[PDB]
Amino acid sequence: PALRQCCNQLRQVDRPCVCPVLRQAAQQVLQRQIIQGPQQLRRLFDAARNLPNICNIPNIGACPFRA
């Protein structure tokens, strides 16, 4: 399970580093994968931004980092 493992890892990083590491994870997918267009790029970053909530990380909401 990708999500499960993802949340396990995200819970080990310092809370103030949660969004910065997710921004880097998003950039890695953008760089390493073929991102077809504007729509896919949007979904990629939406997915990354929402992980703190999807993973139920205490006091951290969706990361407002830019695409």
Binding site: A2, R4, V21, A25, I35, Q40, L41, L44, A47, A48
Partner: peptide
Amino acid sequence: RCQRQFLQHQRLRACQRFIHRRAQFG
């Protein structure tokens, strides 16, 4: 640093797979 933790946790490869699937599907 944050960039360091990213690298030391396999660049959050599991998160990358999840993000990539969401980008391709939905």
